[PDB]
Amino acid sequence: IPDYFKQSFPEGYSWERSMTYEDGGICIATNDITMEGDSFINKIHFKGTNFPPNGPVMQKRTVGWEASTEKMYERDGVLKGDVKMKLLLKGGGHYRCDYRTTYKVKQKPVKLPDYHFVDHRIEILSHDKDYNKVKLYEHAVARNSSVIKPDMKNKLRMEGNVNGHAFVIEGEGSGKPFEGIQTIDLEVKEGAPLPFAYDILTTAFNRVFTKYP
């Protein structure tokens, strides 16, 4: 299994992602990821619209993303990732979302004959009342059908706009890229309090943190 994300450094890479929710809510995100010494730096832009006023996102009735399997595959030399995602809801239901991501990695003609999987677990470990301060965690492992150190920092900034509401979120974190685990502490810098479910942002908050063989 080729690790196209770790081989994109020190150059860096970027991704763009569409997130289509079953009730018409739609979210678009890009991330431009670079490297400064010990740290990965993420510049994220996030737009979402057409979330129903009484749906689970505007009423904050969500309680985390379920474990997911994202399929990594090559289409005309472009590395892509598809995953169907489920947001657990208060009351016990599920709120479905289709993810389509294009991973613009350093090797611009990628060739996998031959697709592979990335299993995800993502969880908000802690948060305050209005999610102005959030501790986020991710576990990612890939499996079959000296630039990057064992410990690394991960900084990010998100400029976002969700149903008309602008906001800015910054974060500092760390992880173990070869083990595929990472944490980050996130702070709403503008637009507090967020009037929507924080869960729609967490997957935008870097596949370099993935356990590849």
Please answer whether residues 168 and 160 qualify as being in contact, where contact means their C-beta atoms are separated by less than 8 angstroms: yes
| Residue 210 placed within a domain | no
What does R_g of the chain's alpha carbons equal in angstroms? 17
Please answer whether residues 208 and 9 qualify as being in contact, where contact means their C-beta atoms are separated by less than 8 angstroms: yes
Which residues are paired to 159 by β-bridges? 45, 168
Strand duo 116-127 + 152-162: pairing = unpaired
Question: CA of 84: how far to CAs of 65, 67, 69, 135, in Å?
Answer: 11, 10, 8, 24
CA distance 48 to 171: 20
| Residue 67 placed within a domain | yes
Solved with = X-ray
| Residue 208 placed within a domain | no
| Residue 173 placed within a domain | yes
**SS3 assignment for 131-154:** CCEEEEEEEEEEECCCCCCCCEEE
Backbone dihedral region for residue 66 (phi beyond 0: left; psi -120 to 50: alpha; all else: beta) = beta
| 193 cis-preceded (ω within 30 degrees of 0) | yes
Q: Looking at residue 24, which CATH number applies to its domain?
A: 2.40.155.10
- Cβ neighbours of residue 21 closer than 8 Å, sequence gap 6 or more: 27, 51, 57, 95, 96, 97
The DSSP symbol for 74 reads E
**Which residue is it, tokens 């706009």?**
161
Question: Residue 180, Cβ neighbours under 10 Å: how many?
Answer: 22
Where would I find the H helices in the chain? 199-202
**Which residue is it, tokens 């965690």?**
137
Return phi, psi of residue 181, to 5°: -130, 150
Which residues are paired to 138 by β-bridges? 122, 182
Distance of CA 115 to the CA centre of its chain: 20
CA distance 1 to 132: 38
Structure tokens that stand for 49 in this block: 């619209």
- CA-based nearest residue to 20, from 88, 96, 80: 96
Total count of domains within the chain: 1
CA distance 54 to 64: 19
Strand duo 39-49 + 68-75: pairing = unpaired
Question: Residue 170, Cβ neighbours under 10 Å: how many?
Answer: 14
**Resolution expressed in Å:** 2.3
Domain, as residue range, for 172 = 6-202
- Cβ neighbours of residue 81 closer than 8 Å, sequence gap 6 or more: 70, 71, 72, 73, 99, 100, 101, 103, 118
